């Protein structure tokens, strides 16, 4: 009558160190294991519960001192648990060692300890064994207390044919012959760590290596054919590793960082401590058959997995309910690190895009708070990255840097709740109470700004396409100073006084805050006038912020379409990628609707306007398949936009390129050839006004 019935393991028995021996046969796809887990009870008990999944356990025994009683083994496979029953109850404080011998088949499902395969350039098929334990698949490789807060140290021993090479979290300490044609690799004992980060690969990979200034041996491992494709990742890893050491003010905790390009990898990449694993796409760069657009994905993934080597692995979440923070921060560090290490890649453009996308989904009533209870690549992580960025810009960058450093130093090799980050952050503003508003309640606020002279009035309310209330960390700038000012809106309304009256004031500086800002009275006109007059006054992101917001407000009926379209008219002058994309994302769907309706003579004037608006930009765009990794996407979209739209210099050079390709994607071109209640309302309110507008 299985003696435990909670999903979570009992907290009164704690592992301290594991001795893992894994002998895995890659020919017969079978592995045998012995697991010695040293433990202590904080409370008397004759029952040890631990996790095990698809493992045939032969014998299990409990050592103390020096005795050695056998243990009765009970299985509850549906809960992925097993119980060990001890003849006598364990004494509190006394160390005991549990030894479990077991066998298992390598998984075919790309989870746990699994078989992956690859055909070499010279035809032969070769097998490799690899791990993926996040979140709960270490229990498929060896029985354990497989929850991330039961941290312990791992001595891993892998047995393989001389044919093969074994790598794991720590460096190889010694290789010894344990039998006829059986080598035993002895890996150095890990620092205290979580079970889900434990990794080992049994393979035939070759590799390349580079030392960091710090003295850390960084290596990328790949199948022998593609190991020449690893040079980019390696150089990136070292730079980022060096960057993070500096940022976190904590040396890389382990002695070596290995990156591995696992062939049939079904996750994207995993942050196994000391042995990060990636899909080949995400790490290797083929000089021929892959675009310079791949390099973004490699750098950013490395950035993410390396970030975890401190934030996630050195300091781990107590439970999966704070996975959002872990990943949010990794994602956020992608943006922070790469923008400094590989500035030429232009990660900024990618980041805010995803924040916008997060907002689009977060505005829907279906949305869920970021911080959910869990009792067992995603937008919640994206949101987490945004709110983290919002926080960082509110405090200084340096303040935020200090908070992370203190946090990491304080909780090293321990676990934490998300509140612990906010507490660290709040001691380098009630950060805890603030961030709770953003993590415990869904969506985000509309900030309504009303100016009377020097008195700047702030209202907040939940934005919806509830009685919700945030601690909004507002930042703003005025016509007077380019200096960023801060105001913490803890209440539904508040006011702040300026020293002197201003022509315009702009909230949500650099688009960094997870919220939208509306301006009552002539405030939008002030800002419309600012952009028309001198648009570089505010940043590119500010402009994008204004256009997005402007048109988004038109949707919820707090702004007349004309006022938004009037703002759009600034785009004549716009050079940068982020605003134009916002212009297009909001203007394009307008005419796409108008096509479906048979009042298609205004359609034509709209398209004329759209093309006349972007005309100047359409020209300056030179016809290469190569530039700033997103700037390419601008070229692509602009050129496509210009034709179908029958721009004359599109169809002057555009078909001259087609006759040059006549001398010696394909669905798109072969289709764009000339051979509902939300809508009904939109056009019902918006058609006439847009016509009356266009006319002028």
Ligand X SMILES: *[C@@H]1O[C@H](CO)[C@@H](O[C@@H]2O[C@H](CO)[C@@H](O[C@H]3O[C@H](CO[C@@H]4O[C@H](CO)[C@@H](O)[C@H](O)[C@@H]4O)[C@@H](O)[C@H](O)[C@@H]3O)[C@H](O)[C@H]2NC(C)=O)[C@H](O)[C@H]1NC(C)=O
Number of shown-chain residues binding ligand X (CB under 6 A) = 8
Taking CB under 6 A as the criterion, the residue among 1, 27, 93, 623 binding ligand X is: 27
Minimal distance, residue 312 CB to Zn ion, in Å:
7
**Choice between 27 and 674, CB closer to ligand X:** 27
Q: Look at residue 327 and give the partner it binds from ligand X, Zn ion, none, a contact being a CB closer than 5 to 8 Å depending on partner kind.
A: Zn ion
Given 68, 69, 108, 161, the residue binding ligand X (CB under 6 A): 161
513 closest CA partner among 479, 558, 477, 567: 477
Name the binder of 161 from Zn ion, ligand X, none, CB < 5-8 A by kind. ligand X
List the one residue from 151, 157, 160, 635 that touches ligand X (CB under 6 A).
160
Distance of alpha carbon 637 from alpha carbon 587, whole angstroms: 14
Q: Does 334 bind Zn ion (CB under 5 A)?
A: no
Taking CB under 6 A as the binding criterion, the range among 20-28, 89-97, 533-541, 560-568 that sits at the site for ligand X is 20-28
Minimum distance, C-beta of residue 99 to ligand X, in the bound complex (Å): 21
Instruction: Name the residue nearer to Zn ion (CB basis): 280 or 334.
Output: 334
Task: Say if residues 159 and 182 touch (Cβ distance below 8 Å).
Answer: yes
Does residue 193 contact residue 153 with C-beta atoms inside 8 Å?
Answer: yes
- 305 given a catalytic annotation: yes
Q: Rank residues 28 and 648 by Cβ distance to ligand X and give the closer one.
A: 28
Instruction: Give one DSSP letter per residue of 412-465, joined into a string.
Output: TTEEE-HHHHHHHHTT---HHHHHHHHHHS-S-EEEEEEEETTEEEEEEEE---
* Phi and psi based region of residue 215 (left: phi greater than 0; alpha: psi -120 to 50; beta: remaining): left
| 1 binding partner (options Zn ion, ligand X, none; Cβ < 5 to 8 Å by kind) | none
- Residue 28 within binding range of ligand X, rule CB under 6 A: yes
Tokens of 696: 């002028």
Nearest-approach distance from CB 207 to ligand X, in angstroms: 21
Distances (CA, A) of 456 to 451, 452, 534, 550, 615: 5, 6, 23, 20, 38
The answer to whether 17 is annotated as binding is no
Candidate segments 178-186, 383-391, 436-444, 686-694, binder of ligand X by CB under 6 A: 178-186
Choose one: 288-296, 319-327, 456-464, 581-589; the region binding Zn ion (CB under 5 A): 319-327
Asked if residue 471 belongs to a known ligand binding site, the reply is no
Out of ligand X, Zn ion, none, what residue 576 binds, judged by CB under 5 to 8 A for its kind, is none
- The distance of closest approach from Cβ of residue 29 to ligand X in the complex, given in angstroms and rounded to an integer, is 10
CB neighbours (10 Å) of residue 249? 15
Q: Tell me how far CA of residue 468 lies from CA of 389, 435, 438, 463, 643, in angstroms.
A: 22, 14, 11, 10, 46
Question: Of the listed pieces 129-137, 214-222, 278-286, 320-328, which binds Zn ion according to CB under 5 A?
Answer: 320-328
Q: In the complex with Zn ion, which residue's Cβ is closer, 130 or 441?
A: 130
From the list ligand X, Zn ion, none, pick the one residue 84 interacts with, judged by a Cβ distance below 5 to 8 Å according to partner type: none
Which of ligand X, Zn ion, none binds 28 (CB below 5-8 Å, type-dependent)? ligand X
Neighbours of 606 (CB within 10 A): 20
* Secondary element (H or E) of residue 87: strand 81-90
Task: Give yes or no for a contact between 547 and 530, defined as CB atoms under 8 angstroms apart.
Answer: no
Q: Which stretch binds ligand X (CB under 6 A): 62-70, 96-104, 176-184, 653-661?
A: 176-184
Piece of the chain touching Zn ion by CB under 5 A; list 77-85, 127-135, 329-337, 683-691: 329-337
Pick the closer one to Zn ion by CB: 309 or 439. 309
Q: Does 330 bind Zn ion (CB under 5 A)?
A: yes
Which partner in Zn ion, ligand X, none is near 365 (CB below 5 to 8 A by kind)?
Answer: none
| Residue 327 is a binding residue for Zn ion (CB under 5 A) | yes
Are the C-beta atoms of residues 518 and 559 closer than 8 Å to each other? Answer: yes
**Residue 269 counted as an annotated binding residue:** yes
- What H or E segment, with its residue span, contains residue 160? strand 153-160
What angle, 0 to 180 degrees and rounded to 10, lies between the N-to-C axes of helices 397-410 and 379-394?
120
327 in a labelled binding site: yes
Considering CB distances under 5 to 8 angstroms, the limit depending on partner class, which of ligand X, Zn ion, none binds residue 622?
Answer: none
Pair 445, 460: CB distance under 8 Å: yes
Q: Supply the minimum distance, in Å, between the C-beta of residue 510 and Zn ion.
A: 26
Rounded to a whole number of angstroms, the minimum distance from the CB of residue 32 to ligand X is: 9
Q: Please say whether the beta carbons of 314 and 323 come within 8 A.
A: no
Nearer to ligand X, 182 or 669 (CB): 182
Who's near 58: CB < 8 A, 6+ residues apart?
Answer: 101, 102, 103
Residue with tokens 């344990």: 178
Non-local CB neighbours of 608 within 8 Å, separated by 6+ positions: none
CA distance 328 to 336: 12
Calculate the alpha carbon distances from 320 to 61, 323, 372, 377 in Å.
31, 5, 10, 15
Q: Whole-angstrom distance between the N-terminal and C-terminal Cα of the chain?
A: 81
CB of residue 33 to ligand X, shortest distance in Å: 13
With CB under 6 A as the contact rule, the residue among 1, 65, 181, 499 that binds ligand X is: 181
CB 32 within 8 A of CB 23: yes
Residue 134 assigned as binding residue: yes
- Choose among Zn ion, ligand X, none what residue 180 binds, the Cβ cut-off being 5 to 8 Å by kind: ligand X
The angle formed by the CA atoms of residues 643, 649 and 653, to the nearest 5 degrees, is 90
To the question of whether residue 271 is assigned a binding role by annotation, the answer is: yes
Rounded Cα distance, 36 and 155, in Å: 10
Pick from 3, 14, 16, 25 the residue near ligand X by CB under 6 A.
Answer: 25
**Of positions 122, 124, 180, 288, contacts ligand X by CB under 6 A:** 180
Q: Which of 454, 347, 335, 344 is nearest to 385 (CA)?
A: 335
Q: What is the nearest approach in angstroms of ligand X to the Cβ of residue 473?
A: 57
> Closest CB to ligand X among 182 and 397?
182
HSE of 376 in the Cβ direction (CA atoms, 13 Å)? 1
Catalytic residue (choose from 147, 280, 305, 576): 305
Tell whether residue 125 is a contact of ligand X (CB under 6 A). Answer: no
376 touches which of Zn ion, ligand X, none (CB within 5 to 8 A by kind)?
none
Q: Measured from the CB atom, is 332 or 444 closer to Zn ion?
A: 332
CB of 182 to ligand X, least distance (A): 6
CA distance 221 to 198: 17
Which of the stretches 137-145, 180-188, 208-216, 251-259 binds ligand X when contact is defined by CB under 6 A? Answer: 180-188
Q: Is 535 a known ligand-binding residue?
A: no
Q: By CB under 6 A, name the binding residues for ligand X.
A: 25, 27-28, 160-161, 180-182
What residue numbers does the annotated binding site for Zn(2+) cover? Answer: 304, 308, 327
Q: By CB under 5 A, name the binding residues for Zn ion.
A: 327, 330
Q: Which residues does the annotation mark as catalytic?
A: 305
């Amino acid at each position: 009558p299985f003696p435990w019935n909670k999903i979570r393991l009992p907290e009164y028995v704690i592992p301290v160190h594991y001795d893992l021996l894994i002998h895995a046969n890659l020919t017969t796809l079978t592995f045998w294991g012995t697991t010695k887990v040293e433990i202590t009870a904080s409370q008397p008990t004759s029952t040890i519960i631990l996790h095990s999944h698809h493992l045939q356990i032969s014998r299990a025994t409990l050592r103390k001192g020096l005795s050695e009683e056998p243990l009765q083994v009970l299985e509850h496979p549906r809960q992925e648990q097993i119980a060990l029953l001890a003849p006598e109850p364990l004494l509190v404080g006394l160390p005991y060692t549990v030894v479990i011998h077991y066998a298992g088949n390598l998984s075919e499902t790309f989870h746990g300890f699994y078989k992956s395969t690859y055909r070499t350039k010279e035809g032969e098929l070769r097998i490799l064994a690899s791990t993926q334990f996040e979140p709960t698949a270490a229990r498929m490789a060896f029985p354990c207390f497989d929850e991330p807060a039961f941290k312990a140290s791992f001595s891993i021993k892998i047995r393989r044919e001389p044919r093969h090479l074994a790598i794991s979290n720590m460096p190889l300490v010694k290789s010894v012959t344990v039998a006829e044609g059986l080598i035993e690799d002895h890996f150095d004992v890990t620092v205290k760590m979580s079970t889900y980060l434990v990794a080992f690969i049994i393979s035939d990979f070759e590799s390349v290596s580079k030392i960091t200034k710090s003295g850390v041996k960084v290596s990328v491992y790949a199948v022998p054919d593609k190991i020449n494709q690893a040079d980019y990742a390696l150089d990136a890893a070292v730079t980022l590793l060096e960057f993070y050491e500096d940022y976190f003010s904590i040396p890389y905790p382990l002695p070596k960082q290995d990156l591995a390009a696992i062939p049939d990898f079904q996750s994207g990449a995993m942050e196994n401590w000391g042995l990060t694993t990636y899909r080949e796409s995400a790490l290797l760069f083929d000089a021929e058959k892959s675009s310079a657009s791949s390099k973004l994905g490699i750098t950013m993934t490395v950035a993410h997995e390396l970030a975890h080597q401190w934030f996630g692995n050195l300091v781990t979440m107590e439970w999966w309910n704070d996975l959002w923070l872990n990943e949010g921060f990794a994602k956020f560090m992608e943006f922070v690190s790469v923008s400094v290490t590989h500035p030429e890649l232009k990660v900024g453009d990618y980041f805010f895009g995803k924040c916008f996308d997060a907002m689009e989904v977060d505005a829907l009533n279906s949305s869920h708070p970021v911080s959910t209870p869990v009792e067992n690549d995603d937008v919640s992580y994206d949101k987490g990255a945004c709110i983290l960025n919002m926080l960082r810009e509110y405090l200084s960058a340096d303040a935020f840097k200090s908070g992370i450093v203190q946090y990491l130093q304080k909780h090293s090799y321990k676990n934490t709740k998300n509140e612990d980050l906010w507490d660290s952050m709040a001691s380098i503003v009630d950060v805890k109470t603030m961030m709770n508003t953003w993590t415990l309640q869904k969506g985000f606020p509309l900030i309504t700004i009303t100016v009377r002279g020097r008195n700047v009035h702030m209202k907040q309310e939940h934005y919806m396409k509830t009685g919700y209330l945030w601690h909004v960390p507002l930042t703003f700038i005025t016509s007077k100073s380019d200096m960023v000012h801060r105001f913490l809106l803890k209440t539904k309304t508040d006011v702040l006084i300026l020293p002197e009256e201003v022509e315009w004031i702009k909230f949500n500086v650099g688009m960094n805050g997870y919220y939208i800002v509306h301006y009552e009275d002539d405030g939008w006109d002030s800002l419309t006038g600012l952009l028309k007059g001198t648009h570089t006054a505010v940043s590119s992101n500010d402009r994008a912020s204004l256009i997005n917001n402007a048109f988004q407000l038109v949707s919820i009926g707090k702004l007349s379409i004309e006022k938004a379209l009037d703002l759009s008219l600034y785009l004549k002058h716009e050079t940068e990628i982020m605003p134009v994309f916002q212009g297009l994302n909001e203007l394009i769907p307008m005419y796409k609707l108008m096509e479906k309706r048979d009042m298609n003579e205004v359609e034509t004037q709209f398209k004329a306007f759209l093309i006349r608006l972007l005309r100047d930009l359409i020209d300056k765009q030179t016809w290469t398949d190569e530039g700033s990794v997103s700037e390419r996407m601008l070229r692509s979209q602009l050129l496509l936009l210009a034709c179908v739209h029958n721009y004359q210099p599109c169809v002057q050079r555009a078909e001259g390129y087609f006759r040059k390709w006549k001398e010696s994607q394909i669905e798109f071109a072969l289709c764009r050839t000339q051979n509902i209640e939300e809508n009904i309302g939109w056009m019902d309110k918006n058609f006439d006004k847009i016509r009356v507008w266009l006319q002028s």
